[PDB]
RNA sequence: AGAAGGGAGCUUGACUGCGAGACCUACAAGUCGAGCAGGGACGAAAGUCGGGCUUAGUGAUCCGGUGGUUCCGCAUGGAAG
RNA sequence: GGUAGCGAAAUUCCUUGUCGGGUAAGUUCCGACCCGCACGAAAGGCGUAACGAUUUGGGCACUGUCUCAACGAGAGACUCGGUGAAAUUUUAGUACCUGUGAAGAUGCAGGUUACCCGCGACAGGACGGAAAGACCCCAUGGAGCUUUACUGUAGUUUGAUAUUGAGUGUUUAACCCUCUAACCCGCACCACUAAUCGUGGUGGGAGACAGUGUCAGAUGGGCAGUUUGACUGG
RNA sequence: AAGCGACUGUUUAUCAAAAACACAGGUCUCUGCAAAAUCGUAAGAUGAAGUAUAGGGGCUGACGCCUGCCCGGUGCUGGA
RNA sequence: CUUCUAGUGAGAAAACAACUGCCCGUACCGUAAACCGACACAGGUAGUCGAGGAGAGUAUCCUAAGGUGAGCGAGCGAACU
RNA sequence: GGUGUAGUGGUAGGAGAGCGUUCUAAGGGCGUUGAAGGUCGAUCGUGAGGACGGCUGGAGCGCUUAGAAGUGAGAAUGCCGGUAUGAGUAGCGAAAGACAGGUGAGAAUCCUGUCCACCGUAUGACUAAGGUUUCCUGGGGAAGGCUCGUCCGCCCAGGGUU
RNA sequence: AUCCGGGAGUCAGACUGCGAGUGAUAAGAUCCGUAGUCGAAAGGGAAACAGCCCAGACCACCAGCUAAGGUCCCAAAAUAU
RNA sequence: GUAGCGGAGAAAUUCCAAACGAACUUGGAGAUAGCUGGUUCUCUCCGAAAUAGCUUUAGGGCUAGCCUCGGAAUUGAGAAU
RNA sequence: UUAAGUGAAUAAGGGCGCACGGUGGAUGCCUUGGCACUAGGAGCCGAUGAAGGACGGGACUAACACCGAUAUGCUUUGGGGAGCUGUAAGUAAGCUAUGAUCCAGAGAUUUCCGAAUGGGGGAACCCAAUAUCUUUUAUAGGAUAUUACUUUUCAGUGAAUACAUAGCUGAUUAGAGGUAGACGCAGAGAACUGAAACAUCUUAGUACCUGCAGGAAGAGAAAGAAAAUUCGAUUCCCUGAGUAGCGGCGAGCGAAACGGGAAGAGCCCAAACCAACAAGCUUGCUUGUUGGGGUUGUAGGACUCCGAUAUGGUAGUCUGUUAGUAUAGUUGAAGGAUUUGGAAAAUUCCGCUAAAGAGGGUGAAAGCCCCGUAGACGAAAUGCUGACAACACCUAGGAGGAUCCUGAGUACGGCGGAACACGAGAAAUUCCGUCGGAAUCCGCGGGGACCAUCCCGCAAGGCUAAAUACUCCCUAGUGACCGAUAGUGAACCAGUACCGUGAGGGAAAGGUGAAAAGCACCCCGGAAGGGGAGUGAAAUAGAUCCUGAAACCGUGUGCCUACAACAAGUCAAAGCUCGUUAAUGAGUGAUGGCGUGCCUUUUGUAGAAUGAACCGGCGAGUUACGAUUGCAUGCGAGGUUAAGUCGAAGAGACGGAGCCGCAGCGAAAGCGAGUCUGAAUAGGGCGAAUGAGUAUGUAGUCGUAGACCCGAAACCAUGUGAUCUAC
């Protein structure tokens, strides 16, 4: 009510005019008025504690081995970022869902050439969040990158 | 994110009018009236759902009693004779038979006759 | 009227710390109480006595005064409080 | 402890007091009487020519004011052509009598009366329309006013101390004095200078007073903020 | 013929024009001039380019005849 | 405007001729349909001029110079206002 | 799952379980061989409500599971808009016109004439405020003008103040 | 029924038996005690009728038995003995 | 020229831009109101009060009484004869 | 034929159902404009004439945008490569491959008003003085410079009054005003409100007004915090803690230090003393001016004694050398046929591309059509930020303890007020007014009245980055934010039209189509409007143009209606008319029974108690932070991190200061499974005796905030009015 830019002024008077008694131009029942509890900035964001994170990290990481959809390799190397040489590499192995590339370190090349595959998501073995591991069916770790993170969830 | 009341009431209202289809003039067009209007026929029809039952059984007796007072009784000294002879016809079929077949009627009205001689 | 009424002798229980259990009651308050311990009055004893035949005679808290105290006391010993 | 003057009054409750006048008939009017509920001498007493769109009582003249109404002229109203609002409004196929009922009914009960649709007229009802009663009580509501209601205060006044210096005398420190250099001058003359402002300069007056600062006692509806209980056959 | 107000005047723009207000005349009181009084924190102003036959405040209200008794109370003035 | 001096201070009086002389307003209404009244509104609006007969007259009635017929009409000729 | 027995009026108010709207995510879908919205039907469920078919319409929208809310309207002498009733009703704002002839699609109302009538210390003439182009000429007739209009202080184009 | 805990709403009642006060042993009056209905209760009877008499509606039926109150016609049932 | 804690008043609470027992406009400001009005979908289970005490209290409130939901507990504590 | 009886049909107008139209602008879908933020830049302009305006400039020019008599534009350096002369159609004249138009850096011009400043004034107007130049034979006319006020420096002139100071003239130096409706520091300073009244108190040193700023301000280098064993300038955040306190001890107000972090930085004078100069020439060395020295509590300096005469730094400049960066740009992969349509990006086949599958456009939905994107490249000019160079500044030890220095009307005290969380209180500490008034290292201040002892510091002089606050504005983005009654008051020529003397108040109003192909020609008509014919996929898409709801107004018809008292229906029902989501079918209905709207407030309502003309839209228990209970999950005698750092405005690890629980009793000293009262080991009070918590999510209630929405009469503080009315 206080912030539209309006009046101060009682619009009429109180009594005589066979009227209803009205405050101001702006108040919540006039056309062009204020609203009454809307939405306000707030923040959404909160905690859990710290031994239900790590273990909902275990707990969905072995969901995906229990099932056979892990699928571990020695290496991915690449001497130039080739976006078709991802592609064949990804039919090698079978691999015809949406997958998750967990990559290990400054492994450039392979993170340039898996980019902009439409099923494809790329992430580093020191950012992997719950909500990456569940949306994808399939889980594409580098032997390097598995022992990485063995070395973080301890 | 904001609500707008966009479809929701139109829909409504229109069923509440179209019950109202062939009350007088600004009752079958004005949902207020409509809506007053229809809330009185709810109640009127629960109230006479009730009432039916009653008016059907005065009209069988009083052509029941019609009937017998033409086989020489009438309606309580019938019924008292079919008692006390264990007959058990509704009042329903009774008088179907006094407007149908007389001949069935005399038959169960002598029956009672002879039954309350005793 | 086995006096709670009325006379005579001696006295200060018109005591201190209390209190099982009840009564009344929205709360806060109000009422009765056997019995235990300290030290006593009256009586030869048994005993009775924590005012008056019973039920009116009174006013939360805050704040101030007087007396006691083996309590505290802004670095320490006191003091102010 | 109310004099002169006046008095049923612009004042007298009882009261249409009593008596005389005026009318055929006068609770109003005029004259007098005194038993002034509750007149009275500058919040003046008692007269008073002239004057008043003042208030009161009576006469002559004149009249439709009335007995008691009639006729006539024009404008609206009425019919036709053009134009074209309003307050109001739960929906309505919206009779009368006697009852009933939040105790005065078009609508409910029992009767009685009544073919369908309009036009010109009247105001008995729709507790008719217009204005969330101005009367009365409440809100531990306001606002304006008063005072010997509470608590303050502007203003006025009185003392101590700073500005503030010097000499004599009179008594138990205080006091009366005298001086001139501070401080003051809405006195005169002079310059800045076109000036009744201002600043400087010289005389004159007055003087440690006054004015001004800090502290203290009085007074203070002039002005301000508030308070002024409940029960209750309203 | 009688009441009220001496008179001409003024008043509630828009329900009150009057017996209300004013008035010429009476009386009490304050004020020695940088007057008292009033506007303003003050500077500055009105009073007044006036000076007690003048200026402020209260009451009464042409003119005629008159205006009694009380100073205990309260204000005001003087006292020591 | 008119005098009198003080005064930096060649020698200007008046004849004819011909030349020079800036900025702002200026239409139209204005006792009204053009202003103030929300209206093409029976209200309000300072000053000058304002004729004849009869009359003291700017009163009154009828007229001169000038202006105007007013922005809804045609019938009828009841009650009532 | 069967079978018995018992229960099931309700204001203030407590407790339970659901219907529908918009948006987010994930999944599986539809659409110019016609989405949303609108309109009609004699359809289904215990309720809020859900479908299917016709006509209209022209580009977007359902369903499942979970999440988040400016999430549901009949009432405040509520606020804004549109439209009724009163009703073809009140009123059309002081006053004298009549006829002939013009113009024109069209005339009581505009033009020209003739007679009649009204003001005349004003309803005549001039001017200071105030207004600000309303002034003149040629066209126009949708709105303004309380009727009409060929007319105008209205509308369009040009011009006028020395 | 009692005990612990979460969330309330109510603090204007009315009439009718019965028994008392105020009143005039008046009031659809007023103020208490005790039982019911209404409040928050539809259905039948009492002409119409919050509170009186009977009786407590989950829903369907063109089946049956009763309550209070009734049986000449309006209007269901005896012109009963 | 005089302006709202104000002005002006031949005095009426009279006037200060159609409103004056204290003008108008903006801001404090979404002032306060134990009072009045309004408060939007559905079905299932249960279901009150209109009293006592204290109250600058009497049409407001607080604690108890009377409703609803979840737990615990020995029982044979509740009711009617 | 006569009597007695029974009796349909016929609508002036009305009702119900259905069909088609009109008005009106709801609903759906959509965006041109908004709202809340993030990261980066920038944080002032102005007498060398501002902010904001007035009036002008075009071939035609009313308005908006741009520009200023050089007026729809002029020069110059770079970019870009074919059209162009804005909105804006319409026509007329032109320009450009000798490079237009357009884009970025630097310049030039810039009327008049306004602080407005030669004098005046009712803003955009009027009137001058002095010099130089012009028109005219000449006067009149035109142009250019200069001319306010104050301060602060210097000459000339100068006086009541002689010497000279007031003054006056001239030259020089700076100000002056606006704002970003924000943020900071000061001066002065309310009220309604809460206390269920009201004075102390609260609201609150808040709102309003005035001054001064800066890009940040303010504070800042111990006369400090503490208590043994200490630490070292200021600011900000977490925690301590709703604690210790204050308080008609009521309503309520409410710390700090320790502990953990962000950022870190220190310096300069006065005084003693020593020289150069001038005056007092005491020719004593008193007054002073310049330079040196010297800056502290472990006391430091002067002064005398010797060493050294080097070495560590800066918070400095419009000085050079490069490196980057902001302000234009360059280049940038890969598709055809088929079906349905007016038109494909859709469907079906068969291919290709990706360091690019972010987004926008194209006749419907596109990786491969266009603009882009990932990646690579670029600056003549001007401005910023680094680095390294110069130049400028600043900085030494050891000893001695004879004497001198170390901030005076000051610290402090009485009286009156205020500030500290602290309301005079037992009142320390810090300020303001008034009066009184120290000491000098054998000293002076503080540790919450006061004293003694011990401990920590050295006032009465100056300056200083960062870590923190804010956004008028410019760039690039983001959203389980709005979608035309919403979102800004304003999506559109809006602070506009309109209202008011004024201050001030203040709106309504988006949508043809893919493309204007926007209806040539004919007919009725004065025109408006309409009917054909044409455009187009569609005109019932025709400019009042998408969709096109309801109220409300009409036209046509199947059934009913002129002896009837009607809250308008409901139950029973003949006749007539139809024939559906196909089933115990649909519309109408003579006649018969029964039946006093909806909402609110009430003991009680049909109420002659209250509200609503009708229809559509909008319109009311929310969030932040705390406290408690129930449910749920993880750990369990334990549970858990806050600020902050790295990270995509995220997850996702560090961080153990701190918080709760694990032991109570007592006013406290204190004792402890017990403790307090008490002489008591008595009795009693409160505790123990296996007796579960903590973090987070979710829902119910409560507290502080407007706290479910609307509604006064009033109170206070700035400003605008005597064009009406009073004197």
Request: glycine share 6%; net charge positive.
């Amino acid at each position: 009510r206080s912030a539209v830019r309006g009046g101060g002024r009682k619009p009429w008077r109180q009594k005589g005019t066979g009227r209803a008694r009205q405050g101001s131009i702006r108040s919540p029942q006039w056309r062009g008025g204020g609203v009454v509890f809307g939405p306000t900035p707030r923040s959404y964001s909160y905690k859990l504690p710290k031994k239900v994170r790590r273990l909902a990290m275990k707990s969905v990481l072995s969901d995906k081995v229990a099932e056979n959809n892990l699928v571990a390799v020695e290496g991915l190397s690449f001497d130039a970022p080739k976006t078709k040489e991802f592609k064949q590499v990804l039919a090698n192995l079978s691999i015809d869902t949406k997958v998750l590339v967990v990559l290990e370190n400054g492994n450039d090349f392979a993170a340039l050439s898996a980019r902009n595959l439409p099923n494809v998501s790329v992430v580093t073995s020191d950012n992997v969040s719950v909500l990456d591991v569940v949306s994808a069916n399939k889980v594409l770790a580098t032997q390097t990158a598995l022992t990485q993170i063995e070395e973080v969830l301890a | 994110a904001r609500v707008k009341g966009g479809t929701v009431t139109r829909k409504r209202r229109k069923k509440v009018l179209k019950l109202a289809k062939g009350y007088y003039g600004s009752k079958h067009t004005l949902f207020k009236s409509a809506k007053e209007q229809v809330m009185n026929s709810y109640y009127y029809a629960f109230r006479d759902r009730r009432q039916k039952k009653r008016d059907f059984r005065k009209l069988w007796i009083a052509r029941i009693n019609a009937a017998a007072r033409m086989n020489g009784l009438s309606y309580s000294k019938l019924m008292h004779g079919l008692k006390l002879a264990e007959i058990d016809i509704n009042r329903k079929m009774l008088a179907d038979l006094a407007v149908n077949d007389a001949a069935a009627f005399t038959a169960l009205a002598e029956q009672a006759k002879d039954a309350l001689s005793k």
